[PDB]
Amino acid sequence: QCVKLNDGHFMPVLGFGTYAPPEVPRSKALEVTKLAIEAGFRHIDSAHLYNNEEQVGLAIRSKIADGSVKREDIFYTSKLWSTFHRPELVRPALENSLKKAQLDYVDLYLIHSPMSLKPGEELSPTDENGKVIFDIVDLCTTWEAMEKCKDAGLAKSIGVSNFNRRQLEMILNKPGLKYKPVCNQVECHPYFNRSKLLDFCKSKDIVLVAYSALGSQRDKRWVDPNSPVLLEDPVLCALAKKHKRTPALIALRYQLQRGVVVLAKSYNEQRIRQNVQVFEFQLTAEDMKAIDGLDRNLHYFNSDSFASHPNYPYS
């Protein structure tokens, strides 16, 4: 149940999303990651921004220890945050992630966002007016530092996240390119199916990875309350009675049947165990056709703050 990445490695088409708001106890990330694995999840998705790589990496040591899994069975992903885009900060940032999670290597290291921010440790640099500070960085140099990380062995694979077609091409069409990005993790759901972006990636043998596939966690910090609730859509709810599953299962299945590796975030035991049931049924071609027409180019992560960035993925 994996896809072959363009570098020879295999990615499990079902990933577990480990992000949770700060007000949530960090101990939960540890617990739920154990649950997730016990449920069947082998693909695990993290980042330095999440502030949970210590607990996630811990939960993996636990499952390898008790004999539930070996390291070669677990697909672990981390992300270089926007404040470490400068070439000299890439590897040290990676090693930092590797340390917290106490791992030798990460199966996948991505560029979290193309929107570079002020170099430093603070993850949200703000001027004296409380405005987020940007930084100008040639993302092609950042990718070079990522390629050195794959050769250095610290990362089995490298890809991008929140990259639009343009920025993506800047990589592919970059001189002396050693490794194409294996994938591009972006927001993707029936209200925002990235039909066109997905098409482009496939021609380049790159894998679109979908986040917010279940409508997002709807944080009050980026998500507008007046936006539609994905898992309450008439078409999805109706198809759910048809196949006698759940709207979340329909959303996830939708992604699988069209060549998209999809992430599912859940800190609830029974909703984690339910999410793996995505492999137990299949929507019809007409169902796929019906869902394909749910797109309203609606991305839940809506910060007009970043819109002012020259690398703002959307335009």
Ligand X SMILES: NC(=O)c1ccc[n+]([C@@H]2O[C@H](COP(=O)([O-])OP(=O)(O)OC[C@H]3O[C@@H](n4cnc5c(N)ncnc54)[C@H](OP(=O)(O)O)[C@@H]3O)[C@@H](O)[C@H]2O)c1
Ligand Y SMILES: O=C(O)c1cccc(Nc2ccc(C(F)(F)F)cc2)c1
Q: What are phi and psi of 301, to 5 degrees?
A: -75, 90
Q: Which of 50, 109, 191, 254 is catalytic?
A: 50
Q: Which amino acid is at 205?
A: D
- Is 191 catalytic? The answer is no
Closest CB 216 distance from ligand Y, rounded Å? 9
- Indicate whether 212 belongs to the interface with ligand X (CB under 6 A): yes
Among 115, 208, 263, 291, binds ligand Y (CB under 6 A): 115
Q: How many residues are there in the chain?
A: 315
Instruction: List the interface residues with ligand Y, window 148-207 (CB under 6 A).
Output: 162
Residue 191 assigned to a binding site? no
- Indicate whether 142 belongs to the interface with ligand X (CB under 6 A): no
Among 84, 163, 192, 211, binds ligand X (CB under 6 A): 211
Nearer to ligand X, 157 or 266 (CB): 266
Residue 211 assigned to a binding site? yes
CB-based burial label for 69 (10 Å; 0-12, 13-18, 19+): middle
Q: What are phi and psi of 313, to 5 degrees?
A: -50, -35
Nearer to ligand X, 76 or 105 (CB): 76
- Indicate whether 142 belongs to the interface with ligand Y (CB under 6 A): no
Strands 75-80 vs 10-12: parallel, antiparallel or unpaired: unpaired
Contact 223, 301 (CB under 8 A): yes
Residue 270 assigned to a binding site? no
- Indicate whether 19 belongs to the interface with ligand Y (CB under 6 A): yes
- Indicate whether 216 belongs to the interface with ligand X (CB under 6 A): yes
- Indicate whether 18 belongs to the interface with ligand X (CB under 6 A): yes
- Indicate whether 134 belongs to the interface with ligand Y (CB under 6 A): no
- Indicate whether 254 belongs to the interface with ligand Y (CB under 6 A): no
* The one segment of 84-92, 206-214, 237-245, 278-286 that binds ligand X by CB under 6 A: 206-214
Alpha helices in the chain (DSSP H): 26-39, 53-65, 87-100, 139-151, 165-172, 195-203, 234-242, 247-256, 269-275, 285-292
| Residue 214 interacting partner from ligand X, ligand Y, none (CB closer than 5 to 8 Å by kind) | ligand X
* Contact mark string toward ligand Y, 288..307, x via CB under 6 A: -------------x----x-
Strand, coil or helix: 12: strand
From its phi and psi, is residue 176 left (phi > 0), alpha (psi between -120 and 50) or beta?
Answer: left
- Indicate whether 57 belongs to the interface with ligand Y (CB under 6 A): no
Alpha carbon distances (Å) from 22 to 25, 26, 28, 33, 268: 7, 8, 11, 17, 17
From its phi and psi, is residue 15 left (phi > 0), alpha (psi between -120 and 50) or beta?
Answer: beta
Contact 191, 296 (CB under 8 A): yes
d(CA 34, CA 63) in angstroms, rounded, equals 7
d(CA 83, CA 90) in angstroms, rounded, equals 10
Closest CB 128 distance from ligand X, rounded Å? 28
Nearer to ligand X, 139 or 214 (CB): 214
Which residues are the active-site residues?
50
Binding residues for substrate: 112
Binding footprint of ligand X on the chain (CB under 6 A) = 17-19, 45, 112, 161-162, 185, 211-217, 246, 248, 263-268, 271, 274-275
Binding footprint of ligand Y on the chain (CB under 6 A) = 19, 47, 49, 113, 115, 162, 301, 306, 313
